[PDB]
Design a binder for these strands. Sequence first.
DNA 1: TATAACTTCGTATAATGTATGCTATACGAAGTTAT
DNA 2: TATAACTTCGTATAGCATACATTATACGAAGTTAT
DNA 3: TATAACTTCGTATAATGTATGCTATACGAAGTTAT
DNA 4: TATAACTTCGTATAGCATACATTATACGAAGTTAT
Lengths: 322, 322, 322, 322
Amino acid sequence: SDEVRKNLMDMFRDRQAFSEHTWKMLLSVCRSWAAWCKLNNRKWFPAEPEDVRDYLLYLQARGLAVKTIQQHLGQLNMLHRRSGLPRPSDSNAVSLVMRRIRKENVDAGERAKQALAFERTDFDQVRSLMENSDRCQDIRNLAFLGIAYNTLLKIAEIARIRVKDISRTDGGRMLIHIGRTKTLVSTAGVEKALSLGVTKLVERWISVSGVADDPNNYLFCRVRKNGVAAPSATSQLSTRALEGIFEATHRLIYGAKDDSGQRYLAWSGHSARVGAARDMARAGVSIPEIMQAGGWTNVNIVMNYIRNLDSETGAMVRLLED
Amino acid sequence: SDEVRKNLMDMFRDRQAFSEHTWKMLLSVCRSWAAWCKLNNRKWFPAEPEDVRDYLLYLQARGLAVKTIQQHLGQLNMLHRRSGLPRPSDSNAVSLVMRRIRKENVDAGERAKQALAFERTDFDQVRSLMENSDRCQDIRNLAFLGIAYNTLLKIAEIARIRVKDISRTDGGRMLIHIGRTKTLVSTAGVEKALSLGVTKLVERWISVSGVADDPNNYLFCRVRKNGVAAPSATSQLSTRALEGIFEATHRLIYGAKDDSGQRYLAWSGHSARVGAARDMARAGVSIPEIMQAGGWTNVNIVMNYIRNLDSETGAMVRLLED
Amino acid sequence: SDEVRKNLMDMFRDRQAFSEHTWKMLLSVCRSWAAWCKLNNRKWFPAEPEDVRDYLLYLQARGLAVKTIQQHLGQLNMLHRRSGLPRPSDSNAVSLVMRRIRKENVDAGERAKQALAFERTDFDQVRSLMENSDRCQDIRNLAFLGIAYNTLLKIAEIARIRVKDISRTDGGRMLIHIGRTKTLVSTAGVEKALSLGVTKLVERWISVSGVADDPNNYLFCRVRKNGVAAPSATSQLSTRALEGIFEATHRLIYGAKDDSGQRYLAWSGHSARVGAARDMARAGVSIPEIMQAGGWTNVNIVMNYIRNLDSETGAMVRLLED
Amino acid sequence: SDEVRKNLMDMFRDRQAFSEHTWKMLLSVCRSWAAWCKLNNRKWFPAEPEDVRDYLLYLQARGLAVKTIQQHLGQLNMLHRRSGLPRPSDSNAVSLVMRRIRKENVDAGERAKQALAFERTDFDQVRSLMENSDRCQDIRNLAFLGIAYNTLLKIAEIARIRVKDISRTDGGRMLIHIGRTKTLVSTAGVEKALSLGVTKLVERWISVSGVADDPNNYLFCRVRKNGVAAPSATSQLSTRALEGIFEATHRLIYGAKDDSGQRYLAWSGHSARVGAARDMARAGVSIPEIMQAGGWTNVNIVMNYIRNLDSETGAMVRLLED
DNA sequence: TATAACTTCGTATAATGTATGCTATACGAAGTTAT
DNA sequence: TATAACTTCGTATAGCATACATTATACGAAGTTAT
DNA sequence: TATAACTTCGTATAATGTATGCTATACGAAGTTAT
DNA sequence: TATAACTTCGTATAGCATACATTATACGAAGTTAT
């Protein structure tokens, strides 16, 4: 009763031990669960297993994805395990219904989607059009698109780059040192090399933006309606803005989005990462090489961007046709 | 007893958490365990470690495969873990016999088997033998044998193919929008293309059958002793019937089985999968293209199918032969 | 007191859960420890940690290897852990002295040795001399040496081979199916292919020995002074005899062993395995390929036969010399 | 208290279980922890989770590397585990801060460093500057710098080389029977060969020194302000003196340090190792030969040394550049 | 008959594996339906 | 507050190298059986 | 001034990492010894 | 004791596919600030 209160207090004291995103989703799931509980006159904490089971079934009935449901269940489990209490998933009712919901949704066809690919051809076509612009906005966007495709870095890692993180090979190729993440949080860190063509795009951006003024400045920054860049060493370009560059570039080439409300109708923050991964594979690049490129530690995730690369090769259709 | 009664009600309420094939196997182990118990005067629930030990030894004497004995122990362990009771595997005596049985059986020379291969040489032979046949069942069986070898699809997947899933891809070749994935993080569906040869086979079947008279009709259907097909959009051919086409075809060519009791004496549902993988290896197709073919995310099974091809003899044979 | 007696009784009942070699060493270490205990008026079971520490120090003082000492400690730990008691290694005194003994011995230069390599050149030289013999003994020995080098199989796996385990590629190369071991105890199993030259050596042995009479016969068998082979399906050629073939072949080429009493002055049961592993490496064979060849599951052991392959490459001595 | 007194006596009796460098580091953390405790009025033994938490936060504020803070917590954890007491890391509050500190520090941009490279361009420059020098210390330092770059050996290993360990391999080139392995399962020793150039350097040192007047004498020795060497078979040069040759040599060429406080501003003991690996990569030497060079069983460190070479730019740069 | 060629054995020392559980195919055989 | 040239020290931080529980090989010596 | 171009935010859904502990180098600085 | 051609069943055994605990992206909508 008080041991629980202490545990929770300890968790909140050292908040910084978890990503802000985890907290954000913890409160969002708690909001959702607490509302369902109120609407059903139930106690939201500690959670009763039969109540949690009803809630997950309610989420499925609302039409949410299987991964969304697993997230709600996962946030509830963390809140309890860290409170010193037993996890809802510790009961049959909850573990069995989750399995049953995954089964029925997947059987009805549900599948986890992945970002619309932005590949070598898309990059070449965008560079060919934007190459000739003098606008600060255009120069920045093209430089961002290039780094994204060349390095396979997530949008959050890109927004984190500082001018001082950039070095250069003896060959004149740019090098961006990256230190952590989801994960990777390490010592040492990594370096991402840019092709000569791409480092040229970045050079042009630094020049017109004037972010080199201070090595602490973040590489990318906002650019106001009048074309003036606003370098900063305290704030970074929101990842929401970066997803906006991918979306506006797609609209530039293909026009306005659908109306279906569906996701991935245009390029998004993860598009170049899935597009590059796939280009390397279709080129014969070895798995360890492809892995190094994306930072993937296992051969599973990799196979996953290629997870949607399965298409009739015609292999058997050739053996037979001869 | 109140709490295991609740757990058993949990299990039934969310029985959809597991597939019907899984349930049947569970019912099957309980019936056997229970029957052995009654016959030997022991309580079957909860199961005592010493009794489960005498039972496992019993299954060994019955000559069952270690794989099989592990399935009995496994289901027995589910029941108890789900129910709140202690698993027999958690016992030292049970843990010890399983290790003894496993080791003893491997020593006597136990090995896993796999489908007798149905290769191109066999497909050619069959085609030639029943290609001009006007018999509706022959027309249907040849079409089946073709798609099986060409697509490497499993029997349950071929049984689900409906008419509206067939389209045209090129040169009048056919396209089968199949679905070979049962996971959330995977590709929605694939498109299997049939050689020009195989396409003519399916065409002659759909014409002699009339399954196309309704898109909802299943590609394959029943053909009665009067050589008349019976299209249907609600009922598909049992995979048992599909395995029969394979054994019947082998009989046509080799006559009655070997009456040795053994398994894989004739062709079975996986024979075309085993054979197409080998032909693809003999013709030196890239492993990735061989995995896309069978839908393998890894190469642990495929390696078993092509293990004895001279192309897979290893580095040592390479070094020794110069 | 009785729970212990039961545990031990359970261990002995299901003896077959452990290799006969484990038992053999368990009794040998117990013999050693029990003798030291008697000579020092101490109780040998349960073992007192301070007593075990004295014993390990006594073994070090007797000049035994670090791996020998770790074995004695390991057998003592198993006897206790399986008796339901705490392991001697569970105490500081024992865990600290073991670490200290490893440290001091290794610091004084001790190193785990490995078998004298039997490589491609040795095999070619032995085949060149024995190729012309008509003696059953010679024909068998050469066939054994060939299979050992070609397959990298341990002597115990070789003595286990039965005539029925041998199949053949479509190319005329022999194939030996192997099922388990130290380890590997599996389902499925593996196939080892022989080069055309080596399968010829084996063919010649089967012919002159007459082991093909029964597919259950073990491939290798004894050969008496009069040249007559003694095929058997119940007994195998002792691994001690197989180590004898490697030793006699070395003496044939180099003459009588030293007098130092040292180990590995001549080829032994593991010689072809370490020799083949090393030949592949020096040939550019990839690790996964080399791994497949020896059955190694990890890249560590492999690096270990090559563990004694480190020699001045001259790499730096070339960069500088130009 | 009786049982932790016994454990502390266990630790001291078998202190040889750990190296002297390990002991010094342990004494160092205790002194700091104890000093912090007294200053803040807390008991230092056993350590309470909440106090260790305030201490770790203290070390973070002192600006120490996460690696360093983990060393304090680590030793603190040894002490307690060895002693029978409960480890502070086993506490939720301590577990939480370590995670917070680790994450917070990685976010501020913390990265590991490594020796400033001493490449061939640097060796050439130094040779040219002090090659005709008659000064005995210059003759000794050049010899050292040569062996370091040529052999990639660490300082403690070069400090141990005695005269009787040098032999001749070919064309009058030298051979150094070194020992770079501290494990039981490894190779006894290696033989490092020196280029013809480097060999002439060591020869001129042994002649101007007279260390060869007794095989037992260490290759390298003290050279007093009167330019007179002092051979000895019982005393070797401190690795600190060896690091001094590196910094002194860098001073000769670049002058006083950068007074920034930072690390690796001049050359250190590992500079030749970092530089020789890069030169070997620039000249495209096979990774295996680069590992044999530095004595690496893996390639996790070597990759850090050659991370920014254009030859190690990745597949993406390869694809993008065509 | 001595004796090659093992086998058995006991102490000494090097090498090696480290998971399961759910679901689909195998196949003889009983059950069903329209020729 | 001689000074070059080290050594010894204390504390930070980079570079490695794993443990546990079996199972299997190394080899001298003594026993075994068809010749 | 309206307005481009963000930022912040809250619900929805995809992606990812899964270790430590022992020992050696780094380097300013105090200690020692023979020029 | 019609029979071809299946279907349904029961039990053996081969073929796959993982969980947990975070952390990070997807995108519409509403608020914010230099122009």
